[PDB]
Ligand binder design. Structure first.
Ligand code: HEC
Ligand code: HEC
Lengths: 294, 103
């Protein structure tokens, strides 16, 4: 019956200027709702949502992925791995009602891109065309990675998403943003210092801080620094693996390079499983609130 | 402004990188004791970017407000990774608290 193919289909009569206004709405709500999660803001959770709706992809049969917007259904919604993402969903809710024409998959992925850009991260090219798919196309729970693992697990897991060593190390840099919450994932604490500004501090912190592996209140083991940060076992394994370690040192010495590689990797992540036809518009780079004068 | 609200804003948005007490430890950024009425990039023991030193400004409540609105805008090349307080109310509250906290 032939492999499952997802053809990008631009929302009828919508263009670059239309998506900028969705972007603006997301960015403005980011700017104004600054109290959430003890003044961390919605930035980090929007990025996590975008990665989680994308990280269900299986390259072998093109199941899961951002295309179908399948996060809107309870099976994927109540995924224990996705605990806490309801906040990001409720954030995007009023925006979806203001732009009812945009597909769920386009909105989720755009939220992540907006967040990264607004948090002074790199520019992330973005492509529209994702289309809402029925509820039985929803991926089973358990396709997202576990935290209590080593580098071997990480490398292997990301093969399924077609990500190589450099792409993995780059994407993990997103753990410069936000924190872990105990009632969500059984891990607690800020990853770094700048919680809502996109930097290369993930790499610098891994290499330069003094970490200790200890039990938290959920009896889960996590790496804690004396400076009060925390890292998951999967995060710390990036300096336990020799090949990972080289790339870690690279991004720690060059933020510009990290920004470039993250932008590629992230867009690749959001676009996995999508076939873009020839008539499809070129990828969009959206203007931040800052360069609009705000 | 409300010093107590400003206390909350400092605890959640500044404390991770700065302390306020006299003779308090340097962290991500420098200790901020006696910050008002002192030249920028002058905390002893701390390693600033030279962009912060080149700015060369005695810190007061007005330039603090502008700085904390958008740190990269006021001092290009600063390494203080902070988005910025975009609500003037919060800037007034924070600076009010910081005025006494670091006396
Ligand atoms: C790290 C994650 C920080 C956060 C959050 C905040 N600050 Fe910061 N600050 C930080 C650094 C690394 C620096 C030095 C910048 C450089 O280029 O060297 C600063 C600088 C300041 C200053 C100026 C100090 C001086 O010139 O002597 C002030 C007055 C200051 N920071 C205050 C401040 C406030 C009020 C913050 C939150 C509302 C805040 N900082 C956040 C590191 C970080
Ligand atoms: C491209 C983005 C991205 C990638 C890839 C990524 N994460 Fe994260 N994750 C985030 C962000 C951003 C947060 C912080 C969310 C917040 O603060 O609300 C987070 C938080 C978490 C949390 C805690 C969530 C909570 O609220 O308690 C866990 C657990 C986690 N990540 C596990 C992993 C593991 C394991 C991997 C890979 C092996 C991984 N993530 C890869 C972006 C990412």
């Amino acid at each position: 019956t032939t492999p499952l193919v997802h053809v990008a289909s631009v929302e009828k009569g919508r263009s670059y200027e239309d998506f900028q206004k969705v972007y603006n709405a997301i960015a403005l709500k980011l700017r104004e709702d600054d109290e959430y999660d003890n003044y961390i803001g919605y930035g980090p959770v929007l990025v996590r949502l975008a990665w989680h709706i994308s990280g269900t992809w299986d390259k072998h049969d093109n199941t899961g992925g951002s295309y179908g917007g399948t996060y809107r259904f309870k099976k994927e919604f109540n995924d224990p791995s996705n605990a806490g993402l309801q906040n990001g969903f409720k954030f995007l809710e009023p925006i979806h009602k203001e732009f009812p024409w945009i597909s769920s998959g386009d909105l989720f992925s755009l939220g992540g891109v907006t967040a990264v850009q607004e948090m002074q991260g790199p520019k992330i090219p973005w492509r529209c065309g994702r289309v809402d798919t029925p509820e039985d196309t929803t991926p089973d729970n358990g396709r997202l990675p576990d935290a209590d693992k080593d580098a071997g697990y990480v490398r292997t897991f990301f093969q399924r998403l077609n990500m190589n060593d450099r792409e993995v190390v780059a994407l993990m840099g997103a753990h410069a943003l936000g924190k872990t919450h105990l009632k969500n994932s059984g891990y607690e604490g800020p990853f770094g210092a700048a919680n809502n500004v996109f930097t290369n501090e993930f790499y610098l912190n891994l290499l330069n801080e003094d970490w200790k592996l200890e039990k938290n209140d959920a009896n889960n083991e996590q790496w804690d620094s004396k400076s009060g940060y925390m890292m998951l076992p999967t995060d710390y394994s990036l300096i336990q693996d020799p090949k990972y370690l080289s790339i870690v040192k690279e991004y720690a010495n060059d933020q510009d390079k990290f920004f470039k590689d993250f932008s590629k990797a992230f867009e690749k992540l959001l676009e996995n499983g999508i076939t873009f036809p020839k008539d499809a518009p070129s990828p969009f780079i959206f203007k931040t609130l800052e360069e609009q004068g705000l | 402004g409300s010093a107590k609200k400003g206390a909350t804003l400092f605890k959640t948005r500044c404390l991770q990188c700065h302390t306020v007490e006299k003779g308090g430890p340097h962290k991500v950024g420098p200790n901020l004791h006696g910050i008002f009425g002192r030249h920028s990039g002058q905390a002893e023991g701390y390693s600033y970017t030279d962009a912060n030193i080149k700015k060369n400004v005695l810190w007061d409540e007005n330039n603090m407000s502008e700085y904390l609105t958008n740190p990269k805008k006021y001092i290009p090349g600063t390494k203080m990774a902070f988005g910025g307080l975009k609500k003037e109310k919060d800037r007034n509250d924070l600076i009010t608290y910081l005025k006494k906290a670091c006396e």
